[PDB]
Amino acid sequence: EMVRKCDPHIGLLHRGTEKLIEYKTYLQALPYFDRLDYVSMMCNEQAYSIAVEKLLNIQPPPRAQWIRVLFGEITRILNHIMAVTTHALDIGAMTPFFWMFEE
Protein backbone atom coordinates (compact mmCIF):
# COMPACT_ATOMS: atom_id res chain seq x y z
CA GLU A 1 0.00 0.00 0.00
CA MET A 2 3.02 2.28 -0.42
CA VAL A 3 2.78 4.83 -3.22
CA ARG A 4 5.74 4.78 -5.59
CA LYS A 5 4.45 7.07 -8.35
CA CYS A 6 1.47 9.39 -8.69
CA ASP A 7 0.29 10.00 -12.26
CA PRO A 8 -2.74 12.31 -12.21
CA HIS A 9 -4.71 11.98 -15.43
CA ILE A 10 -6.80 15.14 -15.66
CA GLY A 11 -8.89 16.26 -18.61
CA LEU A 12 -11.95 14.28 -17.62
CA LEU A 13 -13.64 17.64 -17.11
CA HIS A 14 -12.00 19.63 -19.89
CA ARG A 15 -14.79 21.37 -21.69
CA GLY A 16 -12.90 23.86 -23.79
CA THR A 17 -13.87 26.89 -21.72
CA GLU A 18 -10.99 28.97 -23.06
CA LYS A 19 -11.93 28.28 -26.67
CA LEU A 20 -15.63 28.85 -25.99
CA ILE A 21 -14.77 32.20 -24.42
CA GLU A 22 -13.32 33.37 -27.72
CA TYR A 23 -16.74 33.22 -29.41
CA LYS A 24 -18.42 35.26 -26.67
CA THR A 25 -18.48 38.88 -25.65
CA TYR A 26 -16.91 40.05 -22.41
CA LEU A 27 -20.35 39.80 -20.80
CA GLN A 28 -21.44 36.52 -22.39
CA ALA A 29 -18.18 35.06 -21.11
CA LEU A 30 -18.69 36.05 -17.48
CA PRO A 31 -20.77 32.99 -16.46
CA TYR A 32 -17.97 30.65 -17.57
CA PHE A 33 -15.98 31.96 -14.64
CA ASP A 34 -18.69 30.89 -12.21
CA ARG A 35 -18.13 27.30 -13.36
CA LEU A 36 -14.36 27.21 -13.01
CA ASP A 37 -13.84 27.02 -9.26
CA TYR A 38 -17.48 26.18 -8.90
CA VAL A 39 -17.16 26.27 -5.13
CA SER A 40 -15.81 29.85 -5.18
CA MET A 41 -18.21 31.41 -7.68
CA MET A 42 -18.23 35.10 -6.81
CA CYS A 43 -14.45 35.06 -6.28
CA ASN A 44 -14.04 33.83 -9.86
CA GLU A 45 -16.34 36.54 -11.21
CA GLN A 46 -14.24 39.15 -9.42
CA ALA A 47 -11.01 37.90 -10.95
CA TYR A 48 -12.58 38.23 -14.38
CA SER A 49 -14.16 41.58 -13.51
CA ILE A 50 -10.91 43.15 -12.35
CA ALA A 51 -9.14 42.02 -15.52
CA VAL A 52 -11.66 43.64 -17.85
CA GLU A 53 -11.84 46.80 -15.73
CA LYS A 54 -8.07 47.13 -16.05
CA LEU A 55 -8.34 46.78 -19.82
CA LEU A 56 -11.35 49.12 -19.97
CA ASN A 57 -9.48 51.57 -17.72
CA ILE A 58 -12.62 52.08 -15.62
CA GLN A 59 -13.16 51.97 -11.87
CA PRO A 60 -16.06 50.34 -10.00
CA PRO A 61 -17.81 52.74 -7.60
CA PRO A 62 -17.12 52.82 -3.85
CA ARG A 63 -20.16 50.84 -2.73
CA ALA A 64 -19.75 48.01 -5.23
CA GLN A 65 -16.18 47.50 -4.08
CA TRP A 66 -17.53 46.93 -0.57
CA ILE A 67 -20.19 44.57 -1.90
CA ARG A 68 -17.49 42.64 -3.75
CA VAL A 69 -15.28 42.35 -0.70
CA LEU A 70 -18.31 41.41 1.39
CA PHE A 71 -19.28 38.59 -0.94
CA GLY A 72 -15.62 37.88 -1.63
CA GLU A 73 -15.29 36.81 2.00
CA ILE A 74 -18.62 34.99 2.20
CA THR A 75 -17.35 32.84 -0.66
CA ARG A 76 -14.10 32.15 1.19
CA ILE A 77 -16.04 30.83 4.18
CA LEU A 78 -18.05 28.82 1.67
CA ASN A 79 -14.90 27.49 0.06
CA HIS A 80 -13.13 26.69 3.33
CA ILE A 81 -16.13 24.77 4.68
CA MET A 82 -16.08 22.60 1.57
CA ALA A 83 -12.31 22.17 1.81
CA VAL A 84 -12.20 21.43 5.53
CA THR A 85 -15.21 19.16 5.89
CA THR A 86 -14.85 17.19 2.67
CA HIS A 87 -11.22 16.77 3.64
CA ALA A 88 -12.38 15.48 7.01
CA LEU A 89 -14.96 13.36 5.20
CA ASP A 90 -12.29 11.53 3.20
CA ILE A 91 -10.24 10.88 6.32
CA GLY A 92 -13.37 9.27 7.80
CA ALA A 93 -14.97 11.99 9.97
CA MET A 94 -18.36 12.60 8.41
CA THR A 95 -20.25 14.53 11.09
CA PRO A 96 -18.59 17.96 10.63
CA PHE A 97 -19.68 17.89 7.00
CA PHE A 98 -23.36 17.88 7.98
CA TRP A 99 -22.93 20.65 10.54
CA MET A 100 -21.26 23.06 8.15
CA PHE A 101 -23.36 22.30 5.09
CA GLU A 102 -26.27 23.65 7.09
CA GLU A 103 -24.24 26.86 7.36
Partner: protein
Protein backbone atom coordinates in the same frame (compact mmCIF):
# COMPACT_ATOMS: atom_id res chain seq x y z
CA UNK B 1 -10.30 63.47 -9.87
CA UNK B 2 -12.74 61.43 -11.94
CA UNK B 3 -14.98 58.95 -10.10
CA UNK B 4 -15.27 56.69 -13.16
CA UNK B 5 -11.71 56.45 -14.52
CA UNK B 6 -9.14 54.18 -12.95
CA UNK B 7 -6.50 55.92 -10.79
CA UNK B 8 -3.30 56.17 -12.78
CA UNK B 9 -0.46 55.98 -10.23
CA UNK B 10 2.96 57.23 -11.34
CA UNK B 11 5.91 55.63 -9.58
CA UNK B 12 5.34 52.05 -10.66
CA UNK B 13 5.53 52.83 -14.37
CA UNK B 14 8.85 54.61 -13.83
CA UNK B 15 10.23 51.71 -11.78
CA UNK B 16 9.35 49.06 -14.35
CA UNK B 17 10.96 51.08 -17.13
CA UNK B 18 14.20 51.19 -15.15
CA UNK B 19 14.16 47.44 -14.63
CA UNK B 20 13.27 46.85 -18.27
CA UNK B 21 16.40 48.70 -19.36
CA UNK B 22 18.27 46.73 -16.70
CA UNK B 23 17.20 43.40 -18.17
CA UNK B 24 17.94 44.50 -21.73
CA UNK B 25 21.48 45.67 -20.93
CA UNK B 26 22.34 42.37 -19.28
CA UNK B 27 20.87 39.95 -21.82
CA UNK B 28 21.43 41.77 -25.12
CA UNK B 29 21.91 38.46 -26.90
CA UNK B 30 18.27 37.47 -26.38
CA UNK B 31 16.11 40.54 -25.77
CA UNK B 32 14.28 41.79 -28.85
CA UNK B 33 11.89 44.35 -27.32
CA UNK B 34 10.93 45.78 -23.93
CA UNK B 35 7.69 47.60 -23.24
CA UNK B 36 5.52 48.66 -20.32
CA UNK B 37 1.77 48.92 -20.82
CA UNK B 38 -0.51 51.63 -19.45
CA UNK B 39 -1.66 48.99 -16.97
CA UNK B 40 1.98 49.16 -15.81
CA UNK B 41 3.17 45.66 -16.71
CA UNK B 42 6.69 44.93 -17.93
CA UNK B 43 7.13 42.71 -21.00
CA UNK B 44 10.39 41.21 -22.26
CA UNK B 45 10.25 39.73 -25.76
CA UNK B 46 13.15 37.38 -26.37
CA UNK B 47 14.53 35.24 -29.12
CA UNK B 48 13.42 31.65 -28.42
CA UNK B 49 17.05 30.55 -28.07
CA UNK B 50 17.19 32.75 -24.97
CA UNK B 51 14.37 31.16 -23.01
CA UNK B 52 16.35 29.10 -20.50
CA UNK B 53 19.07 31.73 -19.91
CA UNK B 54 16.49 34.49 -19.64
CA UNK B 55 14.29 32.73 -17.09
CA UNK B 56 17.37 31.49 -15.23
CA UNK B 57 18.79 34.98 -14.77
CA UNK B 58 15.38 36.35 -13.81
CA UNK B 59 14.99 33.56 -11.24
CA UNK B 60 18.44 33.52 -9.63
CA UNK B 61 19.67 37.09 -10.04
CA UNK B 62 19.69 39.02 -6.79
CA UNK B 63 17.90 42.12 -8.10
CA UNK B 64 15.20 40.01 -9.73
CA UNK B 65 14.32 36.79 -7.90
CA UNK B 66 11.27 36.01 -10.03
CA UNK B 67 11.02 32.63 -8.35
CA UNK B 68 7.37 31.75 -9.06
CA UNK B 69 6.17 30.81 -12.53
CA UNK B 70 2.65 32.19 -12.30
CA UNK B 71 1.76 30.43 -15.54
CA UNK B 72 2.93 29.60 -19.04
CA UNK B 73 0.71 29.69 -22.10
CA UNK B 74 0.58 30.29 -25.83
CA UNK B 75 -1.43 32.60 -28.07
CA UNK B 76 -2.20 31.61 -31.65
CA UNK B 77 -1.95 34.43 -34.18
CA UNK B 78 -2.19 32.90 -37.68
CA UNK B 79 -1.14 36.02 -39.59
CA UNK B 80 2.37 35.77 -38.15
CA UNK B 81 4.91 33.36 -39.61
CA UNK B 82 5.77 32.21 -36.10
CA UNK B 83 2.13 31.87 -35.17
CA UNK B 84 2.64 30.80 -31.55
CA UNK B 85 3.51 33.43 -28.96
CA UNK B 86 4.77 31.77 -25.78
CA UNK B 87 4.11 33.79 -22.63
CA UNK B 88 5.70 33.34 -19.21
CA UNK B 89 4.18 35.23 -16.30
CA UNK B 90 6.66 35.36 -13.44
CA UNK B 91 6.25 36.56 -9.87
CA UNK B 92 8.84 38.04 -7.52
CA UNK B 93 7.89 37.71 -3.87
CA UNK B 94 11.07 39.50 -2.83
CA UNK B 95 10.17 42.69 -4.70
CA UNK B 96 6.40 42.19 -4.95
CA UNK B 97 6.47 42.62 -8.72
CA UNK B 98 5.45 40.73 -11.84
CA UNK B 99 7.02 40.37 -15.26
CA UNK B 100 6.00 38.85 -18.58
CA UNK B 101 8.58 37.14 -20.81
CA UNK B 102 7.44 36.31 -24.33
CA UNK B 103 9.00 34.36 -27.17
CA UNK B 104 7.57 32.75 -30.29
CA UNK B 105 7.35 29.45 -32.13
CA UNK B 106 5.97 27.93 -35.31
CA UNK B 107 4.63 24.44 -36.03
CA UNK B 108 8.04 22.88 -36.68
CA UNK B 109 10.29 24.90 -34.33
CA UNK B 110 10.11 23.51 -30.79
CA UNK B 111 11.07 25.55 -27.75
CA UNK B 112 13.40 24.46 -25.00
CA UNK B 113 11.72 23.23 -21.83
CA UNK B 114 12.29 25.20 -18.64
CA UNK B 115 11.46 22.26 -16.35
CA UNK B 116 15.07 22.60 -15.19
CA UNK B 117 14.25 26.15 -14.04
CA UNK B 118 10.64 25.91 -12.83
CA UNK B 119 9.14 22.53 -12.00
CA UNK B 120 5.83 24.39 -12.11
CA UNK B 121 6.21 24.48 -15.90
CA UNK B 122 6.09 20.70 -16.33
CA UNK B 123 2.33 20.52 -16.75
CA UNK B 124 2.10 23.97 -18.33
CA UNK B 125 4.34 22.81 -21.17
CA UNK B 126 2.24 19.68 -21.54
CA UNK B 127 -0.80 21.93 -21.94
CA UNK B 128 0.84 24.07 -24.61
CA UNK B 129 1.89 20.98 -26.54
CA UNK B 130 -1.58 19.46 -26.23
CA UNK B 131 -3.64 22.53 -27.07
CA UNK B 132 -1.31 24.16 -29.62
CA UNK B 133 1.06 21.41 -30.76
CA UNK B 134 4.21 23.26 -29.69
CA UNK B 135 6.87 20.68 -28.95
CA UNK B 136 9.33 21.23 -26.11
CA UNK B 137 12.85 19.84 -26.08
CA UNK B 138 14.03 18.01 -22.98
CA UNK B 139 10.62 17.71 -21.37
CA UNK B 140 10.72 14.78 -18.93
CA UNK B 141 7.18 13.62 -19.83
CA UNK B 142 5.72 15.32 -22.90
CA UNK B 143 2.30 13.84 -23.61
CA UNK B 144 -1.28 15.05 -23.88
CA UNK B 145 -2.76 16.31 -20.62
CA UNK B 146 -6.21 17.77 -21.29
CA UNK B 147 -7.62 16.13 -24.41
CA UNK B 148 -9.10 12.66 -24.73
CA UNK B 149 -6.76 9.76 -25.44
CA UNK B 150 -5.95 9.47 -29.11
CA UNK B 151 -7.44 12.88 -29.83
CA UNK B 152 -6.10 14.15 -33.15
CA UNK B 153 -5.44 17.86 -33.49
CA UNK B 154 -4.69 20.86 -31.31
CA UNK B 155 -8.05 22.39 -30.44
CA UNK B 156 -6.85 25.81 -29.28
CA UNK B 157 -5.36 26.56 -32.68
CA UNK B 158 -7.44 29.28 -34.29
CA UNK B 159 -8.13 27.15 -37.37
CA UNK B 160 -9.49 24.25 -35.34
CA UNK B 161 -13.32 24.33 -35.45
CA UNK B 162 -15.16 25.08 -32.23
CA UNK B 163 -17.14 21.83 -32.22
CA UNK B 164 -14.28 19.71 -33.49
CA UNK B 165 -14.50 17.00 -36.11
CA UNK B 166 -15.67 13.92 -34.20
CA UNK B 167 -18.23 13.19 -31.51
CA UNK B 168 -19.01 10.25 -29.25
CA UNK B 169 -22.08 8.11 -28.74
CA UNK B 170 -22.80 4.65 -27.40
CA UNK B 171 -23.43 2.06 -30.09
CA UNK B 172 -25.39 -0.94 -28.87
CA UNK B 173 -24.39 -3.03 -31.89
CA UNK B 174 -20.71 -3.07 -30.92
CA UNK B 175 -21.41 -2.38 -27.23
CA UNK B 176 -19.04 0.52 -26.70
CA UNK B 177 -18.59 4.25 -27.08
CA UNK B 178 -17.78 5.04 -30.70
CA UNK B 179 -16.50 8.12 -32.49
CA UNK B 180 -18.27 9.45 -35.57
CA UNK B 181 -18.22 12.59 -37.71
CA UNK B 182 -19.88 15.53 -36.01
CA UNK B 183 -23.43 16.45 -36.99
CA UNK B 184 -25.34 19.00 -34.93
CA UNK B 185 -29.11 19.22 -34.74
CA UNK B 186 -28.56 22.97 -34.44
CA UNK B 187 -25.50 24.63 -35.89
CA UNK B 188 -23.60 27.16 -33.81
CA UNK B 189 -24.82 30.53 -35.08
CA UNK B 190 -21.97 32.92 -35.81
CA UNK B 191 -22.78 36.54 -34.99
CA UNK B 192 -21.08 39.40 -36.82
CA UNK B 193 -20.74 41.86 -33.96
CA UNK B 194 -17.90 44.17 -35.01
CA UNK B 195 -19.04 47.72 -35.42
CA UNK B 196 -17.94 49.34 -38.71
CA UNK B 197 -16.90 52.50 -36.84
CA UNK B 198 -13.54 52.92 -35.15
CA UNK B 199 -13.66 52.97 -31.36
CA UNK B 200 -10.05 53.84 -30.43
CA UNK B 201 -8.30 56.54 -32.47
CA UNK B 202 -5.16 55.78 -30.48
CA UNK B 203 -4.74 52.35 -32.11
CA UNK B 204 -5.47 53.30 -35.73
CA UNK B 205 -3.13 51.71 -38.24
CA UNK B 206 -1.57 53.59 -41.16
CA UNK B 207 -3.23 52.71 -44.48
CA UNK B 208 0.10 52.25 -46.31
Amino acid sequence: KRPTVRPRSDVTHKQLSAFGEYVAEILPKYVQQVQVSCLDELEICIHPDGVIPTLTFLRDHTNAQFKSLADLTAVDVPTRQNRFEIVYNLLSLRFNSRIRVKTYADELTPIDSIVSVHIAANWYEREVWDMFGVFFFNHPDLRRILTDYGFEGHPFRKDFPLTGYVELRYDDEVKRVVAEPVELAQEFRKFDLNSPWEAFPAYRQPPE
